[PDB]
Amino acid sequence: MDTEALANYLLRQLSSSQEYNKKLLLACGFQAILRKILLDARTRATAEGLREVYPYHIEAATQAFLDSQ
Amino acid sequence: DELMSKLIELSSKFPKPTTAGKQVEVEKENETIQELMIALQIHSGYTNISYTI
Amino acid sequence: LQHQMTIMDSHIRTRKARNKELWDSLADFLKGYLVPNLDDNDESIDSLTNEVMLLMKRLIEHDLNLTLNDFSSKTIPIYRLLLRANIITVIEGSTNPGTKYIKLIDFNETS
Amino acid sequence: PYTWKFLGISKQLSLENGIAKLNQLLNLEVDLDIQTIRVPSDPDGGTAADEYIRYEMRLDISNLDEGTYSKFIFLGNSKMEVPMFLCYCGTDNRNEVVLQWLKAEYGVIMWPIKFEQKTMIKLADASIVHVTKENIEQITWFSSKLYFEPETQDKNLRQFSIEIPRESCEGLALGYGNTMHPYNDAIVPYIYNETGMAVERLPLTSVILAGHTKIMRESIVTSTRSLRNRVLAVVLQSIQF
Amino acid sequence: KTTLSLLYEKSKQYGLSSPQLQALVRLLCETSIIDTVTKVYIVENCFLPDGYLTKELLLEIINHLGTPTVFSRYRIQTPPVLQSALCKWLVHVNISSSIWLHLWQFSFLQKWITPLVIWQATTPVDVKPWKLSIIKRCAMHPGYRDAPGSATLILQRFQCLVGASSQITESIITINCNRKTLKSHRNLKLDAHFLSILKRILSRAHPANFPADTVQNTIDMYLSEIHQLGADSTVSLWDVTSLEQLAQNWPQLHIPNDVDYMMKPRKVMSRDSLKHLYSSIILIKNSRDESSSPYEWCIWQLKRCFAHQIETPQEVIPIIISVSSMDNKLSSRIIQTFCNLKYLKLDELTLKKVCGGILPLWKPELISGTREFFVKFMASIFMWSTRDGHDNNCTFSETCFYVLQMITNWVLDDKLIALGLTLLHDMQSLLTLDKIFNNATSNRFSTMAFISSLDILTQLSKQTKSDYAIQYLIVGPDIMNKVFSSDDPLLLSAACRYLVATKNKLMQYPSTNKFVRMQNQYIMDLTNYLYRNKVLSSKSLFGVSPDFFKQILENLYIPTADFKNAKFFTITGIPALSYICIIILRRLETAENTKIKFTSGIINEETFNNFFRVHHDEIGQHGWIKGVNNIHDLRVKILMHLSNTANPYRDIAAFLFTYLKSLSKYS
């Protein structure tokens, strides 16, 4: 699934070069924020210390993300 | 066998085979220049890509 | 092998020749094409080109003093072009913020 | 966890003469130990030609893992037609660098090594045996597990194993009497008598001594960080023709 | 469509040369007269090169493959799909190695660039490690779906091709481990229908430039290069790229001391072609001697072959036999070390395959002891076959053929020629022993081996400009009564074919010499046994008195016992030749178009006469062969067919015409 395919997804839920660039940048933002959520999940996984990023780590990452944004 | 005899004779008759610190540094400079432009010209959309030598 | 018997009556010049050719062609390409395309620096392509001469003589040697704050606002787009090229080792410099040090991967390093 | 890979050496290089050019080639200085050992000291094994010379060389910038800990072993003997072989461990590619230096420097040609089924059984016999400070042999028993993998029509018989706990191995060895190589001496004849199966002929894939080592087609895996000397002597004696 | 039709009609038969390709690709990007949907069709259905694309053409093409940026707004842009299609055509058909890496960075081209860069990474020197950082960067970049597998293909080429580098292999493991796109990348398609058209474009006018007959091989090696990836002042010999370059840097070149690499294993140079000459070069640069490195490696692997330690002896031996066929001193060393009974025990097949390859071309620098060494060795292998008792252990016979092929050279040499003769006769005793060649258990291998050795004497007799000792010129009675006692017709053909050659030397000696007297007995007995039929009156048949023959035919049941004796004294009853005479008469009857036919199978006096007496009143007019009126004539006419080039057995009749006067006249 391409980053421009993520832009296509955001286009499908949202609704030509200028709009193309706008939607590509929106896809960049969505991808970066997904990466941020996963990175904060890894950070929470560091606090607990077991093998892998169990689901409540992504959960806690989302609450911290909302509490800071 | 004739060819080997001739080759051995000629090689025996030849001169023997034969400090390059500056020359190899010059070659490193060559590598850096040529490759750096071989990259930048392509990524600059240059109209005539050529053997930079 | 009879031909070498005649050649025995008879190089390093090639290395110097190709180095000087590469240096002058470096200057020619930079002066002629790149900076005129970017058309930044109020079309003062001579001075922007001189800054690019310094940046190039520093990139070629892979000096760590290549820093984004030293890259002027007119040449930060050139750093962006190099980012697109990806030939530059994209160093997320943790030593110093803002003045991130970026350089090309050394073409001379055999491993 | 400690795996190993073995290569043959076509000339009895004096590695100490050339250590410096390796060091500058590898950008580090490697150690080099020297040991003249007498490994097959038992009377039927011999009392002459035992004078193998062992070299320990290591690439340890650190010793946090096998790759950094990766240590080479050269063991040779002048009476041996092909005089010397090589051992190394880990995934580190500096091993390849030193091998390249060897072949380019000493004009020596090198090849990898394989094992036969009888070679595997002899090596397993060599793995259990230990010698005390009083120059007396002793044996430590492990739960052996023979593991075969034949080829048959329509995959009729893919694999089968013969597991032998410590107690059964010790009992078979004692029933055979006081001996030094129980796997060849007692266990395999017992298996053949009970099943008509020739372990030597059958397509053996591995011999596992639980918690001690795994002997395989191309490599040795060891619980200890190092290989005891009889293992290396058996390898060298297997190199030959 | 008219303009495109002209392009189609030209390229389909005229092809498209390099400048024509340069002009058209410029037209596609610079002009609107060609529609975009047709541009993605012209580049792969009309671009038909006469051969490999020249470097400047590729460089000029590469300008089309660039992209606009916030720098290069002014550049006209080819559409990426057309750019991708153009790369796909480039896949169908040395700074360019550096150029094409930066082509690979483009997302939409990178999959099509992988074969192009791989076909530049064709030498250990072309690849550099820092290039993989750029390749790795794209592999790890989001949005480059093809880069992971595309990079892994290039990485898998670098790791095996480089031969000496830091641990870049682990950087391959970082790339996507599913490798979903890499499976297709290592199995690229050449678009056979486009290729098939290109085959004719390469066949119409010109050879030697991507030749038509070699496209399948040329495409296969290009395919193999994509499949096998996962399926100072002095100069190094490895660094040179041409014979001319080797010539120029002769006093600067030095040979790396890495023996194994040289001895075992397209416009850009292929060092395998230079590796064909590395062995010869080393033997010339270094005066070929015991210290020469090719000598050790060939010995070393050969020792491993006999030990069965080599992974594939059949892969190594072809290099060994080819190399060891030359460098006589090396050839001797292999012979001394390996031509012995001990190595026969270890592996007969390799030894017979090996020694048979080398020894026909070998020359002994020392005459003394050579035959004794060979005779001692040859006796052992003979005993080895008989010790086995297996006729399938015919290694003695094959070795006999090989050494006699060598003996041809030993007799082509003016010296050591008596060496070849004595060895020839010493061997020939072995082949003629009954247990190796029994007239009942007659294995052929003995027969062809001997007639070959016998053949050598026929050439030796015809080359009698070089003189010889009368001993070892006549093969001798013990051999000839032996072959006569056998009945293989080719062997009989060889025997007379030898004696006509012996005849050519006969008149050069006085009649009253024993060697002339024994060979006069052969022809007399041979003529009597075959044609004269007066054998019982002879003192002996092949040294055996006739009183046997009458007695041997006792307890020997014959249908027409009225003629017990005369059957065996003719080729028509001599057993192997008897069935031959049936075949001879069948063709004679067919060529004659006889309506009457020889009623019996085997031919003889009573079979002859029996069916004429019933046909006699009309045999006089016509119905059967008109060149015959008695049994002797039928035997004659049986030979008359044998008197021409058609038969392989013609020599038995031709040789003996010279002595029987009537037969000479009929010939």
Residue E417 burial (CB count, 10 A): 17
- Among all chains, which residue has been given the structure tokens 């006249």? E665
Alpha-helix residue ranges (DSSP H) falling in C1-111: 2-7, 13-29, 35-38, 45-60, 76-85
Subunits in contact with chain A (3 or more CB pairs closer than 8 Å) = E
| Tokens matching residue E375 | 């005779």
Can you list the pairs that C52-55 forms with residues at least 24 positions away whose Cβ atoms lie under 8 Å?
Answer: C52/C78, C53/C27
- Closest-CA distance of chain B to residue C85, Å: 6
Contact call for residues E486 and E450 (beta carbons, < 8 A): no
Question: In chain C, what is the straight-line distance between the N-terminal and C-terminal CA atoms, in Å?
Answer: 38
Alpha-helix residue ranges (DSSP H) falling in chain B: 2-13, 21-43
Map residue D182 onto helix, strand or coil.
helix
Paired residues of D206 in beta bridges: D147, D216
Q: Nearest by CB to B20, from E69, E102, E233: name it.
A: E233
Which of residues 5 through 34 in chain D touch E, CB cutoff 8 A?
Answer: 10
The secondary structure element, H or E, covering residue E587 is helix E575-592
Paired residues of D36 in beta bridges: D53
Residue E423 burial (CB count, 10 A): 23
- Closest-CA distance of chain D to residue E395, Å: 24
Characterize E214-226 residue by residue with b for buried, 16 or more Cβ atoms within 10 angstroms of its Cβ, and e for exposed. Answer: ebeeeeeebbebb
By CA distance, what is C80's nearest residue in B? B43
- The radius of gyration of chain C's CA atoms, rounded to the nearest angstrom, is 20
Which of residues 9 through 48 in chain C touch B, CB cutoff 8 A?
Answer: 12, 15-16, 18-19, 21-23, 25-26, 29, 33-34, 37
- Amino acid in the structure at residue E524: M
Give the list of residues 6+ apart from residue E405 with CB closer than 8 angstroms, or none: E360, E452
Residue E228 burial (CB count, 10 A): 13
By CA distance, what is E287's nearest residue in B? B8
In whole angstroms, what is the distance from residue E219 CA to residue E55 CA?
Answer: 20
In whole angstroms, what is the distance from residue D60 CA to residue D32 CA?
Answer: 12
CB contact under 8 A, C22 and B15: no
**Distances in Å between the alpha carbon of E381 and those of B41, E284, E339, E393?**
73, 38, 11, 10
In whole angstroms, what is the distance from residue D232 CA to residue D211 CA?
Answer: 20
In whole angstroms, what is the distance from residue E334 CA to residue E341 CA?
Answer: 14
CB contact under 8 A, A31 and E145: no
In whole angstroms, what is the distance from residue E551 CA to residue E557 CA?
Answer: 12
Q: Say how many CA atoms lie within 13 Å of B23 toward its Cβ.
A: 11
Paired residues of E236 in beta bridges: E254
- Closest-CA distance of chain B to residue C5, Å: 7
Q: Which of E221, E249, E214, E215 is nearest to E235 (CA)?
A: E249
In whole angstroms, what is the distance from residue E88 CA to residue E191 CA?
Answer: 10
Q: Which of E321, E388, E390 is nearest to E356 (CA)?
A: E321
Map residue D75 onto helix, strand or coil.
strand
By CA distance, what is E260's nearest residue in D? D109
Do C and A share at least 3 CB pairs under 8 Å? no
Map residue E647 onto helix, strand or coil.
coil
Exposed/middle/buried for D210, CB within 10 Å: 0-12, 13-18, 19+? middle
Contact call for residues E533 and E547 (beta carbons, < 8 A): no
Alpha-helix residue ranges (DSSP H) falling in chain D: 19-26, 66-69, 94-105, 117-128, 166-176, 182, 188-195, 229-239
In whole angstroms, what is the distance from residue B9 CA to residue B14 CA?
Answer: 9
In whole angstroms, what is the distance from residue E565 CA to residue E555 CA?
Answer: 14
Strand locations in E124-167, DSSP E? none
CB contact under 8 A, B45 and E103: no
- The radius of gyration of chain E's CA atoms, rounded to the nearest angstrom, is 38
Give the list of residues 6+ apart from residue E336 with CB closer than 8 angstroms, or none: none
Contact call for residues E229 and E156 (beta carbons, < 8 A): yes
> For residue E389, is it left (φ>0), alpha (ψ between -120 and 50) or beta?
left
Subunits in contact with chain B (3 or more CB pairs closer than 8 Å) = C, E
In whole angstroms, what is the distance from residue E16 CA to residue E21 CA?
Answer: 6
Give the list of residues 6+ apart from residue A54 with CB closer than 8 angstroms, or none: A45, A48
In whole angstroms, what is the distance from residue E589 CA to residue E638 CA?
Answer: 11
Paired residues of D164 in beta bridges: D144
- Closest-CA distance of chain E to residue D38, Å: 27
Query: Which of D9, D10, D85 is best to mutate for the E interface (most E CBs within 10 A)?
Result: D10
The secondary structure element, H or E, covering residue E503 is helix E489-506
Exposed/middle/buried for E182, CB within 10 Å: 0-12, 13-18, 19+? buried
Q: Nearest by CB to E307, from D93, D100, D241: name it.
A: D241
Contacts of A2 in chain E (CB under 8 A): 143, 145
In whole angstroms, what is the distance from residue E478 CA to residue E434 CA?
Answer: 12
Structure determination method: cryo-EM
φ/ψ of residue B11, rounded to 5: -65, -35
Does C80 contact B at CB distance below 8 Å?
Answer: no
- Amino acid in the structure at residue D125: D
In whole angstroms, what is the distance from residue E338 CA to residue E294 CA?
Answer: 17
Does D109 contact E at CB distance below 8 Å?
Answer: yes
β-strands D5-9, D32-38 pairing: unpaired
Torsion angle of the four alpha carbons E146, E152, E155, E157, in this order, in degrees rounded to the nearest 10: -100
Name the packing angle between helices E328-338 and E293-307 (round to 10°).
30
Does B10 contact C at CB distance below 8 Å?
Answer: yes
Map residue D37 onto helix, strand or coil.
strand
Q: Which of E598, E524, E600, E591 is nearest to E558 (CA)?
A: E600
Paired residues of D209 in beta bridges: D144, D213
Q: Which of D4, D126, D127, D1 is nearest to D71 (CA)?
A: D4
- Among all chains, which residue has been given the structure tokens 């939607």? A23
Strand locations in D10-103, DSSP E? 32-38, 51-58, 71-76, 84-88
By CA distance, what is B9's nearest residue in E? E284
β-strands E253-254, E235-236 pairing: parallel
- Closest-CA distance of chain B to residue E398, Å: 28
Give the list of residues 6+ apart from residue E448 with CB closer than 8 angstroms, or none: E397, E401
| Tokens matching residue E217 | 């091989």
CB contact under 8 A, E69 and C81: yes
Contact call for residues E92 and E21 (beta carbons, < 8 A): no
CB contact under 8 A, D103 and E307: no
- Amino acid in the structure at residue E488: D
CB contact under 8 A, B48 and E252: no
Query: Which of C13, C29, C61, C106 is best to mutate for the B interface (most B CBs within 10 A)?
Result: C29
Angle at Cα D163 formed by Cα D159 and Cα D168, nearest 5°?
Answer: 155
- Among all chains, which residue has been given the structure tokens 């991967």? C105
CB contact under 8 A, D93 and E309: no
Characterize E317-351 residue by residue with b for buried, 16 or more Cβ atoms within 10 angstroms of its Cβ, and e for exposed. Answer: bebbbebbbebbebbbbbbeebbeeebbeebbebb
φ/ψ of residue D58, rounded to 5: -135, 145
Contact call for residues C17 and B30 (beta carbons, < 8 A): no
Contact call for residues E599 and E608 (beta carbons, < 8 A): no
In whole angstroms, what is the distance from residue E65 CA to residue B41 CA?
Answer: 12
- Among all chains, which residue has been given the structure tokens 């016979």? E397
| Tokens matching residue E99 | 């150029």
Contact call for residues D34 and D53 (beta carbons, < 8 A): yes
